[PDB]
């Protein structure tokens, strides 16, 4: 019921926003006018052979890389059953490689610095069709909406795991490439790469670089550990992420304003405070959980020794709130959106979205650790009451 309608509803929302930002001036268009709606929705681009070819070439370039990237191999999760999946993983080498190759096609003139901006509209629809055909196949490898949530758990061909792959290669690297192309397009249309583009493009670049340095970490996440793929997962990978995360740069492509240096200082500080907290918390959890006795913020570490053989840090960021890290991530989000300034609501629809996401994620994780840690978790929730913020929530 809600799922098939949500399923048909999603691709339009991406078109809507894209149309909005590119063809209008990033204003939230809404009228009741018939003629206005025909003008609005005519802007949807049909699927071109050069686009389908280009994407298919890219997606298979990444699949190729994912399969023959140098190494190492890691064991994956799922302690019971065993039920321990092999993961060849070369995200770093892959990333560097596809950069060198892509920039290489670009200097060789064989590809244009701006293809991803130019042939964008058709890509959106090409990938939209490709994910539907794809989700059809994912349904076929393994009862009305199962298209939505999928079957066969973590499906593979030739040591290629699809949830992880789509999570990473053809989805997220495309994100940075688009950003670069859109940077390039701002320069071709206006003579300089404006500072807000450099903030946005650099910030997302570094976030991604950070992501791959911690490629192993995403082997423990809900997407990977628990939820079994499906159209929403696959489409969230190939479509939602690149074509909405690039909205800031999209917007900026024809918004060549600069920011006052105080805005520069506050935005960057926001981003780095956010990274101190997001990466800080995780490292701290780890470095504590490999040596409890070690100091954490000077003081000897305060932990709760859970009956089911695990330790819960009750100090450092984990002492301040149960999810400082999520807060870190959210600061980071807001720091991407603020270069865009206050011309339009569109660039900021990420922090709204991310916020809701984090809220959902928090609730889930909370439940999970109650199912696992029982009273010790409750004891913990007694020690550290604040979910994220933490004086507020």
UniProtKB/Swiss-Prot annotation:
Its EC number is 1.3.1.70. It is found in: Cell inner membrane. It comes from Methylotuvimicrobium alcaliphilum (strain DSM 19304 / NCIMB 14124 / VKM B-2133 / 20Z). NADP(+) binds at residues 285, 289, 313, 318, 325-326, 365, 369-373, 380. InterPro entries: ERG24_DHCR-like, Sterol_reductase_CS. Signal peptide: none annotated. Pfam families: ERG4_ERG24 (PF01222). Residues 25-48, 110-119, 185-192, 250-257, 344 are periplasmic. Keywords: Cell inner membrane, Cell membrane, Lipid biosynthesis, Lipid metabolism, Membrane, NADP, Nucleotide-binding, Oxidoreductase, Steroid biosynthesis, Steroid metabolism, Sterol biosynthesis, Sterol metabolism, Transmembrane, Transmembrane helix. The chain crosses the membrane at residues 4-24, 49-69, 89-109, 120-140, 164-184, 193-213, 229-249, 258-278, 323-343, 345-365. Belongs to the ERG4/ERG24 family. Residues 70-88, 141-163, 214-228, 279-322, 366-393 are cytoplasmic. It is a multi-pass membrane protein. This is Delta(14)-sterol reductase. The keyword Cell inner membrane applies. Reduces the C14=C15 double bond of 4,4-dimethyl-cholesta-8,14,24-trienol to produce 4,4-dimethyl-cholesta-8,24-dienol. Complements the deletion of the Delta(14)-sterol reductase gene ERG24 in yeast. GO terms for cellular component: plasma membrane. The gene is erg.
């Amino acid at each position: 019921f809600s799922w098939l309608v949500l399923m048909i509803a999603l691709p339009p929302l991406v078109y809507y926003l894209w149309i909005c930002v590119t063809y209008y001036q990033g204003e939230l268009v809404f009228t009741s006018d018939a003629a206005a709606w025909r003008r609005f929705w005519s802007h949807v681009a049909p699927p071109t052979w050069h686009a389908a070819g280009l994407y298919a070439a890219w997606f298979l370039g990444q699949a190729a890389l994912q399969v023959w990237a140098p190494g190492p191999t890691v064991q994956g999760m799922k302690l019971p059953d065993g039920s321990r999946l092999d993961y060849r993983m070369n995200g770093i080498f892959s990333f560097l490689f596809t950069l060198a190759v892509v920039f290489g096609l670009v200097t060789m003139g064989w590809l244009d610095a701006t293809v991803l901006y130019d042939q964008l509209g058709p890509l959106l629809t090409v990938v939209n069709i490709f994910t539907f055909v794809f989700a059809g196949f994912l349904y076929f490898w393994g009862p009305f909406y199962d298209y939505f949530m999928g079957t066969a758990l973590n499906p593979r061909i030739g040591s290629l795991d699809l949830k992880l792959f789509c999570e990473a290669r053809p989805g997220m690297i495309f994100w940075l490439l688009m950003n670069l192309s859109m940077a390039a397009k701002q320069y071709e249309l206006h003579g300089t790469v404006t500072v807000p583009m450099l903030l946005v493009v650099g910030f997302q670049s570094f976030y991604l670089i950070d992501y791959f340095i911690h490629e192993e970490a995403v082997l423990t996440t809900w997407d990977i550990k628990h939820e079994k793929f499906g159209w929403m997962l696959c489409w969230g990978d190939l479509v939602w992420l690149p074509f909405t995360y690039t909205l800031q740069a999209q917007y900026l492509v024809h918004h060549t304003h600069d920011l006052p240096v105080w805005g520069i200082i506050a935005i960057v500080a926001l981003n780095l405070a956010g990274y101190a907290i997001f990466r800080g918390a995780n490292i701290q959890k780890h470095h504590f959980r490999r040596d409890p006795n070690r100091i954490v913020w000077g003081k000897p570490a305060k932990y709760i020794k859970t009956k089911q053989g695990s330790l819960l840090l009750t100090s450092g960021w984990w002492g301040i709130a149960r999810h400082m890290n999520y807060f870190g991530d959210l600061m980071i989000a807001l720091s991407w959106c603020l270069p865009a300034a206050f011309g339009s609501p569109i660039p900021y629809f990420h922090i709204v979205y991310f916020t809701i996401l984090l809220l959902h994620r928090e609730k889930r994780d909370d439940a999970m650790c109650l199912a696992k840690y029982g009273e010790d978790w409750l004891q913990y929730r007694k020690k550290v009451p604040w979910r994220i913020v933490p004086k507020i929530y």
